[PDB]
Amino acid sequence: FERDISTEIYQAGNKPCNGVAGFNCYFPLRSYGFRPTYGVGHQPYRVVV
Amino acid sequence: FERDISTEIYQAGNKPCNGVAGFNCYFPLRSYGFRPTYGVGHQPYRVVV
Amino acid sequence: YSVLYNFAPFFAFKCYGVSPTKLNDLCFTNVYADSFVIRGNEVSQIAPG
Amino acid sequence: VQLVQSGAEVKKPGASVKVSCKASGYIFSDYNIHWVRQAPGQGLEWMGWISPDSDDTNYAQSFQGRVTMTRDTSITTVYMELSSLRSDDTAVYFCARSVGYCSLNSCQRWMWFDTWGQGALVTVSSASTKGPSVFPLAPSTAALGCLVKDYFPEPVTVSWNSGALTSGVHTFPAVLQSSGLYSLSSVVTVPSSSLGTQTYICNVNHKPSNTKVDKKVEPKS
Amino acid sequence: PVLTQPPSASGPPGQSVSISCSGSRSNIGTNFVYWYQQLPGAAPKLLIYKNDQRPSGVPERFFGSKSGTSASLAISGLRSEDEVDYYCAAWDDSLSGHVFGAGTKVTVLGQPKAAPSVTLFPPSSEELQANKATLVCLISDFYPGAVTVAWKADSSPVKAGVETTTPSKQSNNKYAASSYLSLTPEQWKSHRSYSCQVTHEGSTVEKTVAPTE
């Protein structure tokens, strides 16, 4: 019952990254995309709770 | 002090679930779980009246 | 709860808690709602516990 | 876990098979064992389930009088007895370990088979038992084969000149005829540098008969 | 009764292929369906149980589903292990026994068409001094199976007790067949030549060998 957002760059190693990428400064947002060619399980489901 | 042995599916929606369940109708019978790795309060006792 | 029935059969109506069929007169005090879209391979991974 | 069992050879119809799925890696008092057969082409057929702790066996609606069960504890095995067999269900039998213990027919709702036993090739045929026989084949470079006919029980190991000089060995399926016997062939790819000066020798080995023969090639051109 | 299944719902790799498992009112719709994974020429194993969870070691890529009376399994992309048969099964209260599927095979979208390699193999003189003559015609290196086998003895077509095998799997991912008959020596001496009719796809490849060679 709390919300958080990740605007900053995730640190997976030891590198100062405040706006730059690298081998460890991964962006915390990963792409999904909606294509009508995936499987039914890979097709998105709409979950309301 | 009555007996009931029924295998018919009990509906929980609007459509008549005589033999079709999985969308909005549930099976009225479920299994127990008795593992020795569970807690002391989750152990089966053979009770007699 | 009439909006729950006339919005097509649901693929995953499975849930843990009070059954919605006996919520006709069970008045509550506080309730909140929220929705999100997630991959269907982990739609069974949204459950209490 | 292991679900190893022995392999019964070809037996005439009208007798009973004898295969035992050995139980290891678990206790033999909580796991239900299941027996199925798999004919080629089509799917699977279910026979029955055995209680591991007591003699509580429930059978299917397909076969009732043909199939009869018994069990043992000290050896920790299972006995198979299929009286009055017919030559129409030549299939491999599997023992499948299923998690969960139940005694009634209504228990089959949360039941699945986790691991299955390996293949045990068991069938029924009337073909007679025969020792290995070697016949040569005339070459036509030039190549020639090794005709092995009417050997029982299957299989035999093809040792071309006892492994001293062999190259390009091939495998062939056994042909089906009305006599019920089966044959094997083995042709080797050889150059033309050794046709008449050096003769090829094909040897096969059969374990149950403990007999061996040889061929005499006579190449001509 | 038995669960109705499609014969072969094959699909090219790189995209998802959907497979269906349609049953009856009592076969499915009140119980839980199960999907069984079997390697070719090996023992089967379970892929998914209760349409919701998978065993340990089972990849997440896999997914199972049901439609009230038909079961569907979802796979995304085909690989070197995804050329295997898929079996669907459940339990019913009508027969009080296990109900298993029919059979479905999926393949990727494999050699192209080619020419047969026919080898004519006369019997040796050891068979002739044994008062017989086994005439054989060995074929290899052909795919798929379209060899129109036929017999011609150059005098009259005679077929009696012909033992020919289907094109089976070889050790070089090819097919091979033969033609066996323990012919009497007088029948072979009465025929001047024996040429096995090897015609694959129309582009026939044939050879002949003289009895004296």
Question: Who contacts E136 (Cβ-Cβ below 8 Å, separation ≥6)?
Answer: D137, D145, D147, D185, E121, E123, E178, E179, E180
With residue D115 as reference, give the H or E element that holds it: strand D113-116
Residues of chain E with Cβ-Cβ distance to C44 below 8 Å are 52-53
Do residues E87 and E33 make contact, with C-beta atoms less than 8 angstroms apart?
no
Q: Is residue C19 within 8 angstroms of chain B, CB to CB?
A: yes
CA nearest to D148, candidates D167, D128, D171, D164: D171
**Using CA atoms, how far apart are residues C16 and E52, in angstroms rounded to an integer?**
14
Query: Letter for the amino acid at A36?
Result: P
**What method did the depositors use to determine the structure?**
cryo-EM
Mapped to the 3 state alphabet, what secondary structure does chain E carry? CCCECCCCCCCCCCCCEEEEEECCCCCCCCCCCEEEEECCCCCEEEEEECCCECCCCCCCCCEEEECCCEEEEEECCCCCCCCCEEEEEEEECCCCEEECCCCEECCCCCCCCCCCEEEEECECHHHHCCCCEECEEEEECCCCCCECCECCCCCCCCCCCCEECCCEECCCCCEEECEECEECHHHHHCCCCCCCECCECCCCCCCCCCCCC
Question: Who contacts D88 (Cβ-Cβ below 8 Å, separation ≥6)?
Answer: none
Question: Who contacts E9 (Cβ-Cβ below 8 Å, separation ≥6)?
Answer: E17, E18, E19, E20, E104, E106
Do residues D10 and D153 make contact, with C-beta atoms less than 8 angstroms apart?
yes
Q: Is residue E48 within 8 angstroms of chain A, CB to CB?
A: no
Residues of chain A with Cβ-Cβ distance to C40 below 8 Å are 40-45
Hey, are the CB atoms on A44 and C34 less than 8 Å from each other?
A: no
Compare all CA atoms of chain C with the CA of B10 and give the residue at the minimum distance. Answer: C21
Order across the sheet with D44-50: list the strands.
D57-59, D44-50, D32-38, D92-98, D113-116
Interface test with E, best of D1, D32, D34, D44 (most E CBs within 10 A): D44
Three-state SS at C4: helix
Hey, are the CB atoms on A41 and C41 less than 8 Å from each other?
A: yes
Strand D134-136 relative to strand D144-149, pairing: antiparallel
- How many residues in total does chain C contain? 49
Q: Is residue D109 within 8 angstroms of chain B, CB to CB?
A: yes
**Using CA atoms, how far apart are residues E145 and E168, in angstroms rounded to an integer?**
9
What subunits touch chain C, counting only 3 or more CB pairs under 8 A? A, B, E
Q: What is the nearest CA distance from B42 to chain D, expressed in angstroms?
A: 18
Q: Decide: B and A in contact? Rule: 3+ Cβ pairs under 8 Å.
A: no
Strand E44-49 relative to strand E63-66, pairing: unpaired
**Using CA atoms, how far apart are residues E178 and E138, in angstroms rounded to an integer?**
5
Three-state SS at B46: coil
Q: Is residue E65 within 8 angstroms of chain C, CB to CB?
A: yes
CB-CB: which of C34, C37, C41 is closest to A46?
Answer: C37
The residues after which chain A has a C–N gap greater than 2.5 Å are: none
Mapped to the 3 state alphabet, what secondary structure does D11-59 carry? ECCCCCCCCCECCECCCCCCCEEEEEEECCCCCEEEEEEECCCCCCEEE
With residue D146 as reference, give the H or E element that holds it: strand D144-149
Do residues A2 and C32 make contact, with C-beta atoms less than 8 angstroms apart?
no
- What resolution in angstroms does the PDB record give? 4.7
How is residue C5 annotated by DSSP? T
Q: How far is CA A42 from CA A45, E10, E52, in A?
A: 9, 19, 15
Q: Is residue E189 within 8 angstroms of chain D, CB to CB?
A: no
Q: Which residue has the tokens 């129309």?
A: E202
Q: How far is CA D159 from CA D142, D169, D174, D185, D186, in A?
A: 20, 10, 18, 12, 10
How is residue D219 annotated by DSSP? -
Compare all CA atoms of chain B with the CA of E26 and give the residue at the minimum distance. Answer: B19
Three-state SS at C20: helix
Q: How far is CA B45 from CA B34, B42, B48, D100, D134, in A?
A: 10, 9, 9, 19, 71
Q: How far is CA E62 from CA E14, E32, E38, in A?
A: 15, 17, 15
Residues of chain E with Cβ-Cβ distance to B22 below 8 Å are 29, 66, 68
Hey, are the CB atoms on D110 and B31 less than 8 Å from each other?
A: yes
Q: Is residue C9 within 8 angstroms of chain B, CB to CB?
A: yes
Question: Who contacts D14 (Cβ-Cβ below 8 Å, separation ≥6)?
Answer: D84, D85
CA nearest to C44, candidates C20, C18, C13, C19: C13
Is the preceding omega at residue D155 within 30 degrees of 0, hence cis? yes
**Using CA atoms, how far apart are residues B9 and B23, in angstroms rounded to an integer?**
12
CA D60 distance to own-chain centroid? 26
Q: Decide: B and C in contact? Rule: 3+ Cβ pairs under 8 Å.
A: yes
Hey, are the CB atoms on C40 and E63 less than 8 Å from each other?
A: yes
Question: Who contacts E102 (Cβ-Cβ below 8 Å, separation ≥6)?
Answer: D42, D43, E2, E3, E4, E5
**Using CA atoms, how far apart are residues D150 and D133, in angstroms rounded to an integer?**
7
Question: Who contacts D150 (Cβ-Cβ below 8 Å, separation ≥6)?
Answer: D130, D133, D181, D182, D183
Hey, are the CB atoms on D110 and B7 less than 8 Å from each other?
A: no
Is the preceding omega at residue D208 within 30 degrees of 0, hence cis? no
Q: How far is CA B10 from CA B3, E28, E104, in A?
A: 17, 16, 34
